[PDB]
Amino acid sequence: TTLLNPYFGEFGGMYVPQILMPALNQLEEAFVSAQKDPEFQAQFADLLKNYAGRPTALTKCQNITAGTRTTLYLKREDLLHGGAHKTNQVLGQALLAKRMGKSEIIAETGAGQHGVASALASALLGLKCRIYMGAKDVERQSPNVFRMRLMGAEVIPVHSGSATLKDACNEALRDWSGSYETAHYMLGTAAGPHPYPTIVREFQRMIGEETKAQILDKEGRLPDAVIACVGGGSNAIGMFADFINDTSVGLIGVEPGGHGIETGEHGAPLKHGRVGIYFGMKAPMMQTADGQIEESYSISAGLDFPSVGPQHAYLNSIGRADYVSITDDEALEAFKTLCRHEGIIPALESSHALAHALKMMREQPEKEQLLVVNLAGRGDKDIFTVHDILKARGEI
Amino acid sequence: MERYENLFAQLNDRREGAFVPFVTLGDPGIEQSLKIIDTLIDAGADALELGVPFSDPLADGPTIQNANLRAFAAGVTPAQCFEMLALIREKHPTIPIGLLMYANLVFNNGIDAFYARCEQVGVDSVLVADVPVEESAPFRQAALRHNIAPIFICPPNADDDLLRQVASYGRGYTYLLSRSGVTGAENRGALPLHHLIEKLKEYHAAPALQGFGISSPEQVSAAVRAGAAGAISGSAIVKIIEKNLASPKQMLAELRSFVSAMKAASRA
Ligand SMILES: Cc1ncc(COP(=O)(O)O)c(/C=N/[C@@H](CO)C(=O)O)c1O
Ligand SMILES: O=P(O)(O)OCCNS(=O)(=O)c1ccc(OC(F)(F)F)cc1
Ligand SMILES: [Cl-]
Ligand SMILES: [Cl-]
Ligand SMILES: [Cl-]
Ligand SMILES: [Cl-]
Ligand SMILES: [Cl-]
Ligand SMILES: [Cl-]
Ligand SMILES: [Cl-]
Ligand SMILES: [Cl-]
Ligand SMILES: [Cl-]
Ligand SMILES: [Cs+]
Ligand SMILES: [Cs+]
């Protein structure tokens, strides 16, 4: 029994051990209550504005579209405190934890951005934060691990399974299954068991709401399409939500194509995986033929979630949103292009979204189109990866 | 078949609890796993709970995480596990065989087809660890169509509605969870469960087996004294495998001693 539908069509649900059902019910009730509470809303708005820095800019990128009939804006989540969109919803989830009387936070992280966001919110709001991270990710993300530790969080390497994000996800749920009376699980994407896909969408929806207001002010109409990269689906659903009922507005989600879809080395389960049940939800998965969960591959660390949020799978199924993929090489060309032509260093994750927008433009340069790319993070973290690739290429 | 029904009736006649070990199929390899299982039976196991190796066993603590990993290191697949189950049944006619599954392995090639294969090899029950009662409908329906008992979890903090649901929908046995958290011998249950046991009986539930953190004879006896039909022990058994990987001989000897002692604790 729940207050809200746990499914988006056939996707989603609450596939957790029975022991965790009271925790999910409690969280759902607290969320529904908070959404009607003006004091909660005011506290959340205060943090978003005065701490995180909302609203974020909407930047018109003139140089990269010169000579075409594309007009391209970037929604600047890269300018949010922490350097990515992840900050928005951790502030909301931290307030929910407090609302429920909890003083401890559990979080999973892959690339480390969600871990950093969880740590900073916990530091600000006086919560004790513990973060699970696959040991392979710990090894390759020492800057983020150190950021989390500077902010007083405990970072716990996970050695089980593949020692990556899915394994961290499992460990977080194992912990929660024995600690939910005192700890809140601050899940980092619009996936997992209900009510997380719903909560994360609502706590990221200011992205799209601001974009709508900003584009109306600047252009006097809605965009032809909004475009966002899709790991688990939080930044994309945050951009998409407020436009779902505006049926003229295209919603384009970009999954990582990795080395190419045909190689199998990608992270595009929504379009190229198979529906399974894992991490508390029924959704498209990266998985073996006999149903073992597999890793996602991308040049971009943050597109490693081996599934996708159920609302994305649903919006795809009904034809409301369209999902595409972009390869490592395409994402890299987009990264270099934005740096050189706009002076903005984009996260390799959102470089996938930008690459798809550039393709929309270049393929049909005389098509009139007003596009918004969600620039969900800054790319300072990625300059080492990019350096190493360019050096190997003999570009430098 | 009626393997659990027959077992519990026979144990009732002997005023006896059931002792039910868990192991991971194919840990530490197929041939040794088969020998392990035969030893468990010979030493006094009344029924078995058998795990199919899964990549993401999110209800299991480190001991059983590591069992899954050992089976994968040996190349064990679900298909091989079903071959093992067929042979186990071909050797042992009456012992109830329960599987511990995760949802993706059941759903992967079709829920109905999964349960049809269980019936074909002679499995008696399936517990899907990450499917709560709320999501159970297609699983329990497929189970019953194929003569498989769907095993439901009764948590320590069960409300009356949940008790009534588990009682109504379940067959074979009701899993009486010792405590919150995940599997592991290092964490003993700290709550009296006799009230839950009494309500389950009132509601005509399948007989209760207590599970999680059971590692000692006194806990088996306590389960019986509290009114449960018996007790399940996994991590404590798997620890013996882990400890003795280098000596299959000593492994089987220690498994036999442990199971014998745990089974003795169930007797009137
Ligand atoms: C900078 C950036 N952009 C996009 C995404 C993609 O996440 P959504 O699809 O927006 O939820 C991520 C993800 N990061 C996770 C997983 O590794 C993490 O940090 O733990 C990211 O760090
Ligand atoms: O002795 P322990 O502590 O290792 O416990 C033995 C567990 N083995 S099992 O197959 O019964 C078993 C039963 C239920 C489980 O999760 C669930 F409750 F969520 F469904 C996991 C394993
Ligand atoms: Cl509802
Ligand atoms: Cl449904
Ligand atoms: Cl359009
Ligand atoms: Cl369309
Ligand atoms: Cl046009
Ligand atoms: Cl299927
Ligand atoms: Cl199968
Ligand atoms: Cl005692
Ligand atoms: Cl006794
Ligand atoms: Cs232009
Ligand atoms: Cs994805």
XYZ file of C-alpha atoms and ligand atoms in Angstrom:
719
model
C 0.000 0.000 0.000
C 1.388 3.388 -1.057
C 0.177 6.984 -1.446
C 1.560 7.286 -5.003
C 1.750 4.918 -7.986
C 5.165 3.145 -7.701
C 5.153 2.438 -11.466
C 5.496 4.440 -14.651
C 3.522 2.120 -16.892
C 5.250 -1.254 -16.522
C 8.519 0.243 -15.233
C 9.613 0.921 -11.653
C 8.133 -0.693 -8.544
C 9.561 -1.491 -5.108
C 11.722 -4.602 -5.511
C 13.478 -4.519 -2.146
C 13.670 -7.074 0.701
C 10.514 -7.004 2.850
C 12.569 -5.545 5.740
C 13.002 -2.275 3.747
C 9.340 -1.713 2.856
C 8.588 0.351 6.044
C 11.565 2.563 5.175
C 10.213 3.207 1.679
C 6.679 3.844 3.004
C 8.024 6.254 5.635
C 10.044 8.138 3.009
C 7.082 8.372 0.621
C 4.803 9.750 3.388
C 7.450 12.261 4.477
C 7.905 13.432 0.873
C 4.183 13.817 0.181
C 3.882 15.744 3.471
C 6.901 17.953 2.727
C 5.569 18.831 -0.734
C 2.505 20.387 0.963
C 4.529 22.112 3.702
C 5.323 25.807 2.968
C 8.028 25.857 5.662
C 9.813 22.897 4.065
C 9.531 24.546 0.644
C 10.901 27.842 1.993
C 13.864 26.107 3.666
C 14.644 24.223 0.449
C 14.379 27.410 -1.631
C 16.671 29.222 0.845
C 19.363 26.543 0.508
C 19.022 26.410 -3.275
C 19.396 30.185 -3.615
C 21.782 31.325 -0.877
C 23.952 28.210 -0.545
C 23.869 26.521 -3.976
C 23.443 29.731 -5.987
C 20.145 29.159 -7.915
C 18.943 30.333 -10.347
C 21.598 29.108 -12.755
C 22.397 31.052 -15.932
C 20.989 30.144 -19.346
C 23.838 30.862 -21.759
C 23.363 31.546 -25.473
C 26.185 29.886 -27.410
C 26.593 31.953 -30.577
C 30.057 30.938 -31.811
C 29.389 27.216 -32.036
C 26.209 27.653 -34.139
C 27.399 30.484 -36.413
C 26.321 30.023 -40.041
C 23.461 27.621 -39.181
C 19.783 28.104 -38.241
C 20.297 26.431 -34.847
C 20.032 28.624 -31.746
C 21.650 26.809 -28.796
C 21.375 27.644 -25.091
C 23.164 25.834 -22.273
C 21.481 25.537 -18.895
C 24.398 26.161 -16.550
C 24.154 23.543 -13.793
C 27.979 23.552 -14.025
C 27.792 26.822 -12.043
C 25.892 25.277 -9.100
C 27.818 24.858 -5.842
C 29.674 21.561 -6.149
C 29.978 21.889 -9.948
C 27.052 19.649 -10.916
C 23.267 19.341 -10.737
C 23.615 16.632 -8.035
C 23.614 19.412 -5.402
C 19.956 20.329 -5.982
C 18.346 17.091 -4.850
C 20.777 16.258 -2.028
C 19.661 19.488 -0.309
C 16.036 18.357 -0.594
C 16.798 14.794 0.546
C 18.832 16.125 3.496
C 15.785 18.174 4.540
C 13.608 15.049 4.234
C 16.050 13.168 6.493
C 15.708 15.934 9.086
C 11.913 15.963 8.677
C 11.901 12.249 9.582
C 14.132 12.853 12.606
C 17.203 11.181 11.117
C 20.746 12.409 11.721
C 22.734 9.977 9.550
C 23.095 9.787 5.757
C 24.068 6.829 3.545
C 24.953 7.473 -0.105
C 26.391 5.539 -3.053
C 28.663 7.068 -5.653
C 30.413 6.003 -8.845
C 32.329 8.947 -10.296
C 32.228 10.631 -6.871
C 30.083 13.658 -7.767
C 27.028 12.413 -5.887
C 29.294 11.484 -2.959
C 30.728 14.995 -2.855
C 27.200 16.470 -3.058
C 26.002 14.197 -0.242
C 29.044 15.115 1.859
C 28.612 18.863 1.388
C 24.893 18.791 2.206
C 25.593 16.643 5.275
C 28.346 18.999 6.476
C 26.072 22.016 6.057
C 23.066 20.469 7.798
C 24.861 18.594 10.626
C 24.290 15.026 9.447
C 26.780 12.182 9.781
C 27.515 10.968 6.266
C 28.861 7.615 5.087
C 29.457 6.987 1.396
C 29.873 3.617 -0.332
C 32.076 3.556 -3.421
C 33.335 0.561 -5.409
C 37.034 0.022 -4.634
C 37.924 0.385 -8.333
C 36.190 3.793 -8.328
C 37.943 4.791 -5.085
C 41.291 4.055 -6.783
C 40.484 6.104 -9.889
C 38.713 8.997 -8.136
C 41.177 10.035 -5.424
C 40.352 13.799 -5.855
C 36.640 13.214 -5.152
C 37.395 10.792 -2.313
C 39.604 13.437 -0.708
C 36.910 16.120 -1.181
C 34.394 13.857 0.594
C 36.846 13.226 3.450
C 37.671 16.952 3.819
C 33.950 17.521 4.318
C 33.888 14.998 7.183
C 32.212 12.081 5.376
C 33.286 8.471 5.841
C 34.158 6.864 2.500
C 33.863 3.081 2.569
C 35.419 1.144 -0.345
C 33.304 -1.772 -1.582
C 35.247 -4.852 -2.706
C 32.365 -7.222 -3.499
C 31.097 -8.045 -6.992
C 32.758 -5.898 -9.650
C 33.910 -3.290 -7.064
C 32.086 -0.545 -9.008
C 28.914 1.539 -8.759
C 26.377 -1.300 -8.816
C 28.276 -2.900 -5.936
C 28.211 0.377 -4.003
C 24.435 0.545 -4.629
C 24.036 -2.913 -3.097
C 26.178 -2.033 -0.071
C 24.156 1.136 0.616
C 20.939 -0.909 0.642
C 22.531 -3.589 2.861
C 23.446 -0.889 5.371
C 20.036 0.763 5.163
C 18.310 -2.595 5.739
C 19.866 -2.632 9.216
C 19.969 1.119 9.991
C 16.833 2.782 8.542
C 15.489 3.790 11.983
C 18.345 6.307 12.311
C 19.775 6.724 8.786
C 18.373 8.004 5.494
C 19.552 6.569 2.180
C 20.371 9.540 -0.058
C 20.108 7.781 -3.456
C 21.917 9.741 -6.161
C 19.786 9.362 -9.314
C 16.173 9.116 -10.556
C 16.183 5.329 -10.218
C 15.909 2.669 -7.551
C 12.690 1.659 -5.739
C 9.729 3.989 -5.427
C 9.635 6.653 -4.117
C 13.136 7.627 -5.258
C 12.445 8.191 -9.035
C 9.608 10.536 -8.025
C 11.486 12.365 -5.245
C 14.623 12.894 -7.324
C 12.564 14.260 -10.252
C 10.682 16.708 -8.031
C 13.890 17.842 -6.316
C 15.580 18.437 -9.712
C 12.599 19.948 -11.570
C 13.742 23.540 -10.963
C 16.179 22.920 -13.796
C 13.366 22.728 -16.375
C 11.199 25.305 -14.587
C 13.940 27.919 -14.730
C 14.834 26.964 -18.318
C 11.206 27.470 -19.369
C 11.029 30.933 -17.764
C 14.430 31.951 -19.133
C 13.742 30.804 -22.695
C 10.338 32.520 -22.717
C 11.996 35.746 -21.561
C 14.807 35.573 -24.121
C 13.069 34.014 -27.140
C 9.336 34.513 -26.494
C 8.574 30.819 -27.100
C 9.330 27.327 -25.807
C 12.368 25.389 -27.116
C 12.006 22.990 -30.032
C 13.914 20.430 -27.942
C 15.720 20.040 -24.638
C 18.668 17.628 -24.580
C 20.340 15.921 -21.616
C 22.730 13.045 -20.924
C 21.238 9.994 -19.199
C 23.093 7.935 -16.642
C 20.540 7.048 -14.034
C 18.382 9.912 -15.351
C 18.340 12.675 -12.692
C 19.652 15.674 -14.655
C 17.581 14.698 -17.695
C 14.305 14.227 -15.812
C 15.042 17.482 -13.971
C 15.251 19.283 -17.320
C 12.344 17.360 -18.873
C 9.732 17.422 -16.079
C 8.242 20.900 -16.554
C 8.042 20.393 -20.341
C 6.319 16.982 -20.352
C 2.875 18.578 -20.835
C 4.222 20.949 -23.527
C 3.847 18.443 -26.317
C 5.583 20.628 -28.942
C 8.838 20.399 -26.947
C 11.128 17.504 -27.844
C 12.716 15.632 -24.938
C 15.977 14.022 -26.019
C 18.005 11.804 -23.700
C 21.555 10.800 -24.626
C 22.995 7.542 -23.317
C 26.758 6.808 -23.620
C 27.622 4.806 -26.723
C 31.130 4.063 -25.395
C 33.299 2.384 -28.069
C 30.176 1.974 -30.227
C 26.871 0.176 -29.640
C 27.959 -2.681 -31.926
C 31.011 -3.370 -29.707
C 28.822 -4.057 -26.663
C 31.100 -1.651 -24.753
C 28.600 1.072 -23.944
C 26.202 2.291 -21.281
C 22.982 2.516 -23.280
C 20.548 0.029 -21.657
C 17.375 1.999 -22.414
C 17.858 1.509 -26.148
C 20.295 -1.438 -26.281
C 19.890 -3.407 -23.061
C 17.141 -5.693 -21.786
C 14.510 -5.115 -19.101
C 15.370 -6.749 -15.786
C 14.730 -6.336 -12.062
C 17.555 -4.912 -9.978
C 18.284 -2.095 -7.537
C 14.646 -2.094 -6.461
C 13.132 -1.515 -9.918
C 11.991 -3.073 -13.171
C 13.924 -1.214 -15.867
C 16.254 -1.741 -18.871
C 19.577 -3.213 -17.657
C 23.094 -3.958 -18.808
C 23.116 -7.707 -18.155
C 24.446 -11.025 -19.420
C 22.288 -13.489 -21.339
C 21.701 -15.439 -18.122
C 20.745 -12.362 -16.104
C 23.911 -11.310 -14.232
C 24.134 -7.517 -13.940
C 26.967 -5.954 -15.975
C 28.834 -2.643 -15.899
C 28.176 0.319 -18.169
C 31.188 1.560 -20.115
C 31.807 5.212 -21.049
C 34.836 7.480 -21.330
C 32.795 9.570 -18.867
C 32.945 8.241 -15.297
C 29.513 9.597 -14.355
C 27.540 7.682 -16.992
C 28.355 4.350 -15.267
C 24.941 3.468 -13.783
C 24.144 0.092 -15.472
C 20.424 0.790 -15.776
C 18.156 3.805 -16.263
C 15.384 5.469 -14.307
C 11.906 3.967 -14.893
C 10.296 7.270 -15.883
C 12.720 7.452 -18.838
C 11.847 3.923 -19.921
C 8.161 4.890 -19.670
C 8.475 8.219 -21.548
C 10.309 6.307 -24.264
C 7.688 3.571 -24.479
C 4.841 6.058 -25.107
C 6.939 8.098 -27.568
C 6.973 11.253 -25.408
C 10.775 11.285 -25.161
C 13.396 10.060 -27.616
C 16.681 8.446 -26.613
C 19.872 8.327 -28.648
C 23.537 7.532 -28.004
C 26.839 9.338 -28.474
C 30.228 7.616 -28.610
C 33.394 8.423 -26.638
C 34.914 10.094 -29.710
C 31.829 12.230 -30.362
C 31.709 13.340 -26.708
C 35.411 14.263 -26.913
C 34.948 16.384 -30.040
C 32.101 18.228 -28.293
C 34.244 18.806 -25.187
C 37.068 20.338 -27.245
C 34.610 22.418 -29.294
C 32.946 24.046 -26.286
C 36.278 24.849 -24.631
C 37.719 26.482 -27.746
C 34.620 28.280 -29.012
C 32.714 29.265 -25.852
C 35.351 29.220 -23.082
C 33.350 26.662 -21.075
C 34.899 23.365 -20.011
C 31.982 20.860 -19.895
C 31.783 17.630 -17.938
C 32.414 14.657 -20.237
C 28.956 13.397 -19.169
C 27.108 16.438 -20.525
C 29.535 16.581 -23.461
C 27.391 13.660 -24.716
C 24.294 15.908 -24.699
C 26.226 18.700 -26.416
C 27.571 16.258 -29.043
C 24.022 15.236 -29.936
C 22.902 18.864 -30.248
C 25.902 19.557 -32.502
C 24.873 16.593 -34.651
C 21.279 17.895 -34.883
C 22.745 21.200 -36.083
C 25.424 19.882 -38.458
C 23.214 17.242 -40.091
C 20.553 19.811 -41.029
C 22.212 23.247 -40.819
C 19.340 25.091 -42.531
C 16.732 23.667 -40.131
C 15.390 26.382 -37.832
C 15.664 24.961 -34.325
C 15.871 26.377 -30.802
C 17.720 23.889 -28.611
C 18.645 23.781 -24.932
C 21.400 21.454 -23.712
C 21.466 20.725 -19.987
C 25.095 21.359 -18.974
C 24.795 19.281 -15.838
C 28.427 19.607 -14.697
C 31.746 21.376 -15.190
C 34.649 19.528 -16.809
C 37.645 20.567 -14.667
C 37.565 17.027 -13.260
C 38.012 15.639 -16.789
C 41.039 17.560 -18.063
C 43.435 14.784 -16.976
C 41.441 12.141 -18.872
C 41.261 14.384 -21.926
C 44.983 15.242 -21.690
C 45.898 11.552 -21.655
C 43.712 10.755 -24.678
C 45.031 13.684 -26.723
C 48.630 12.752 -25.859
C 48.052 9.138 -26.932
C 46.606 10.471 -30.201
C 49.633 12.671 -30.860
C 47.329 15.695 -30.885
C 49.672 16.980 -28.164
C 4.375 -32.680 -4.414
C 3.844 -32.209 -0.662
C 7.442 -32.435 0.575
C 7.274 -29.701 3.223
C 3.819 -30.812 4.388
C 5.067 -34.390 4.772
C 8.283 -33.299 6.536
C 6.507 -31.100 9.087
C 3.924 -33.803 9.831
C 6.689 -36.371 10.411
C 8.671 -33.934 12.591
C 5.497 -33.128 14.546
C 5.061 -36.863 15.222
C 8.600 -36.912 16.654
C 8.054 -33.627 18.554
C 11.025 -32.362 16.571
C 12.107 -29.091 14.934
C 13.560 -28.899 11.414
C 17.200 -27.960 10.896
C 17.744 -26.383 7.483
C 21.221 -25.403 6.205
C 21.855 -22.881 3.433
C 24.732 -23.112 0.954
C 25.504 -21.479 -2.394
C 25.283 -23.958 -5.267
C 28.687 -24.520 -6.849
C 30.663 -23.035 -3.932
C 33.574 -23.723 -4.120
C 33.055 -25.784 -7.272
C 30.308 -28.007 -8.709
C 31.764 -31.356 -7.607
C 32.699 -30.194 -4.097
C 29.311 -28.464 -3.707
C 27.540 -31.726 -4.537
C 29.629 -33.529 -1.915
C 28.977 -30.730 0.611
C 25.229 -31.056 0.073
C 25.266 -34.852 0.436
C 27.229 -34.456 3.685
C 24.695 -31.927 5.018
C 21.912 -34.425 4.313
C 23.773 -37.404 5.772
C 24.595 -35.432 8.934
C 20.919 -34.673 9.582
C 19.637 -31.755 7.462
C 15.821 -31.944 7.293
C 15.567 -29.624 4.254
C 17.902 -27.458 2.164
C 18.045 -23.826 1.153
C 20.207 -23.417 -1.930
C 21.437 -20.177 -3.471
C 21.986 -19.650 -7.181
C 25.109 -17.431 -7.630
C 24.019 -13.890 -8.455
C 26.079 -10.794 -9.262
C 24.246 -8.518 -6.806
C 23.067 -10.417 -3.671
C 21.840 -7.357 -1.816
C 20.243 -9.252 1.124
C 23.484 -11.081 1.941
C 26.358 -10.116 4.244
C 30.070 -10.719 3.443
C 30.172 -14.446 4.174
C 27.575 -15.240 1.532
C 28.772 -12.463 -0.792
C 32.061 -14.384 -0.774
C 30.331 -17.724 -1.457
C 28.711 -16.187 -4.538
C 32.135 -14.906 -5.618
C 33.791 -18.328 -5.176
C 31.088 -19.977 -7.309
C 31.628 -17.334 -10.024
C 35.390 -17.916 -9.864
C 34.576 -21.566 -10.637
C 32.459 -20.477 -13.649
C 29.123 -21.564 -12.102
C 26.048 -20.501 -14.075
C 22.278 -20.778 -13.346
C 22.072 -23.517 -16.002
C 24.710 -25.563 -14.205
C 22.846 -24.966 -10.944
C 19.687 -26.469 -12.450
C 21.715 -29.488 -13.567
C 22.930 -29.783 -9.961
C 19.385 -29.492 -8.586
C 18.154 -32.262 -10.908
C 20.922 -34.578 -9.648
C 20.302 -33.675 -5.988
C 16.636 -34.640 -6.417
C 17.615 -37.809 -8.337
C 19.592 -38.870 -5.221
C 17.183 -37.808 -2.464
C 13.417 -38.404 -2.876
C 11.758 -36.671 0.061
C 13.992 -33.868 1.370
C 12.432 -30.408 0.685
C 14.658 -28.309 -1.565
C 14.187 -24.564 -1.410
C 15.930 -22.039 -3.652
C 17.153 -18.603 -2.562
C 16.832 -16.410 -5.651
C 17.137 -12.791 -6.651
C 14.401 -11.366 -8.863
C 16.463 -10.820 -12.001
C 17.400 -14.518 -12.255
C 13.710 -15.464 -12.021
C 12.490 -12.799 -14.467
C 15.399 -13.115 -16.904
C 14.014 -15.783 -19.238
C 10.397 -15.464 -18.101
C 8.890 -15.911 -14.634
C 6.609 -18.759 -15.688
C 9.476 -20.581 -17.438
C 11.634 -20.228 -14.309
C 9.075 -21.950 -12.112
C 8.400 -24.577 -14.789
C 12.116 -25.502 -14.701
C 12.015 -25.661 -10.877
C 9.099 -28.112 -11.141
C 10.939 -30.174 -13.787
C 14.041 -30.629 -11.605
C 12.038 -31.273 -8.415
C 12.495 -28.056 -6.371
C 9.860 -27.554 -3.639
C 10.047 -23.834 -2.822
C 11.452 -20.523 -4.024
C 12.254 -17.469 -1.901
C 12.951 -14.368 -3.981
C 14.881 -12.129 -1.616
C 14.199 -8.761 -3.305
C 10.486 -9.302 -3.987
C 8.296 -8.045 -1.089
C 4.692 -9.181 -0.673
C 3.616 -5.985 -2.483
C 5.375 -7.136 -5.675
C 4.808 -10.858 -5.217
C 1.761 -11.529 -7.439
C 3.388 -12.903 -10.675
C 5.972 -14.854 -8.658
C 3.531 -16.535 -6.277
C 1.088 -17.278 -9.131
C 3.796 -18.909 -11.278
C 5.038 -20.839 -8.215
C 1.642 -22.321 -7.462
C 0.931 -23.179 -11.103
C 4.102 -25.286 -11.049
C 3.617 -26.915 -7.621
C 6.308 -24.702 -6.040
C 5.807 -23.176 -2.588
C 6.295 -19.366 -2.607
C 8.229 -18.466 0.549
C 7.290 -15.171 2.198
C 9.273 -13.198 4.757
C 7.714 -12.255 8.072
C 9.925 -9.428 9.457
C 10.105 -8.764 13.256
C 8.165 -5.520 12.776
C 5.315 -7.129 10.794
C 1.936 -5.460 11.268
C -1.326 -7.423 11.326
C -2.038 -6.882 7.609
C 1.379 -8.283 6.648
C 0.890 -11.294 8.939
C -2.449 -11.966 7.250
C -0.907 -11.574 3.780
C 2.071 -13.862 4.436
C -0.264 -16.410 6.075
C -2.691 -16.433 3.132
C -0.287 -16.331 0.190
C 2.569 -18.518 1.484
C 3.045 -22.279 1.281
C 5.694 -24.710 2.493
C 7.076 -22.624 5.350
C 6.921 -19.007 6.533
C 10.326 -17.388 6.822
C 10.554 -15.841 10.297
C 13.281 -13.185 10.067
C 15.405 -12.948 13.249
C 16.321 -9.277 12.849
C 16.814 -6.385 10.430
C 19.969 -6.244 8.272
C 21.432 -8.911 5.974
C 22.579 -12.523 6.326
C 25.440 -13.137 8.732
C 26.524 -15.244 11.699
C 28.221 -12.244 13.368
C 24.856 -10.604 14.170
C 22.444 -12.512 16.432
C 18.736 -11.651 16.587
C 17.740 -9.685 19.695
C 13.936 -9.772 19.566
C 11.490 -12.354 21.004
C 9.427 -13.733 18.134
C 6.882 -15.876 19.991
C 4.052 -13.354 19.431
C 4.631 -13.388 15.666
C 4.808 -17.203 15.788
C 1.457 -17.379 17.615
C -0.283 -14.973 15.209
C 1.005 -16.894 12.191
C -0.513 -20.080 13.633
C -3.813 -18.292 14.325
C -3.908 -17.258 10.668
C -3.103 -20.792 9.402
C 0.262 -19.766 7.927
C 2.746 -22.322 6.634
C 4.953 -23.479 9.572
C 7.602 -20.948 10.607
C 11.341 -21.414 10.198
C 13.506 -18.842 11.955
C 16.388 -17.496 9.862
C 19.262 -14.945 10.027
C 22.146 -15.096 12.493
C 21.468 -18.705 13.637
C 24.929 -20.161 14.317
C 24.633 -22.204 17.527
C 22.680 -25.198 18.923
C 21.108 -23.067 21.643
C 19.508 -20.872 18.965
C 17.950 -23.912 17.270
C 16.499 -25.085 20.571
C 15.284 -21.526 21.324
C 13.450 -21.373 17.974
C 11.632 -24.637 18.776
C 10.875 -23.539 22.350
C 9.383 -20.278 20.989
C 6.943 -22.330 18.879
C 8.704 -22.237 15.479
C 8.809 -25.402 13.369
C 12.592 -25.076 13.014
C 15.578 -22.951 12.051
C 17.771 -22.081 9.039
C 21.549 -21.540 9.230
C 23.574 -20.224 6.278
C 26.582 -18.063 7.126
C 27.772 -20.441 9.880
C 27.783 -23.323 7.355
C 29.414 -21.224 4.621
C 32.105 -20.089 7.088
C 33.154 -23.756 7.428
C 33.525 -23.979 3.654
C 35.540 -20.741 3.578
C 37.784 -21.860 6.446
C 38.584 -25.217 4.880
C 38.951 -24.479 1.149
C 42.434 -26.029 1.262
C 41.247 -29.286 2.853
C 38.070 -30.834 1.326
C 38.476 -33.694 3.845
C 38.505 -31.406 6.895
C 35.727 -29.316 5.337
C 33.351 -32.290 5.129
C 34.320 -33.486 8.623
C 33.605 -30.054 10.161
C 30.368 -29.663 8.176
C 29.218 -33.049 9.459
C 30.038 -32.232 13.094
C 28.316 -28.843 12.865
C 25.148 -30.111 11.180
C 24.957 -33.091 13.553
C 25.150 -30.776 16.576
C 22.624 -28.300 15.167
C 20.191 -31.090 14.258
C 20.572 -32.644 17.721
C 19.439 -29.311 19.200
C 16.115 -29.603 17.344
C 15.116 -32.913 18.934
C 12.585 -33.495 21.716
C 28.743 15.231 -13.554
C 27.702 14.181 -13.803
N 26.834 14.375 -14.822
C 25.906 13.424 -15.069
C 25.763 12.289 -14.315
C 24.706 11.289 -14.703
O 23.740 11.163 -13.618
P 22.240 11.496 -13.945
O 21.797 10.665 -15.143
O 22.059 12.964 -14.142
O 21.524 10.957 -12.704
C 26.661 12.065 -13.247
C 26.581 10.868 -12.412
N 27.378 10.664 -11.429
C 27.099 9.604 -10.440
C 27.262 8.214 -11.041
O 28.653 7.933 -11.167
C 27.941 9.871 -9.194
O 28.627 10.850 -9.078
O 27.795 8.960 -8.278
C 27.640 13.027 -13.003
O 28.537 12.915 -12.009
O 22.430 -17.753 8.748
P 22.414 -16.468 7.943
O 22.386 -15.235 8.795
O 23.480 -16.459 6.857
O 21.005 -16.461 7.169
C 20.761 -17.521 6.198
C 20.137 -16.873 5.018
N 19.941 -17.799 3.899
S 18.464 -17.868 3.261
O 18.579 -18.554 2.014
O 17.607 -18.424 4.267
C 17.933 -16.212 2.975
C 16.621 -15.855 3.262
C 16.206 -14.552 3.064
C 17.092 -13.612 2.553
O 16.719 -12.257 2.335
C 15.457 -11.840 2.528
F 15.021 -11.960 3.776
F 15.416 -10.556 2.232
F 14.582 -12.444 1.738
C 18.402 -13.973 2.274
C 18.821 -15.273 2.472
Cl -1.453 4.960 -5.457
Cl 2.541 -2.581 -12.674
Cl 9.740 19.656 -31.679
Cl 9.436 13.028 -31.569
Cl 13.192 25.293 -40.704
Cl 11.739 -11.411 -19.364
Cl 16.461 -20.229 -15.613
Cl 19.605 -19.157 24.723
Cl 15.632 -29.156 22.320
Cs 22.912 30.657 -35.410
Cs 21.854 4.959 -19.096
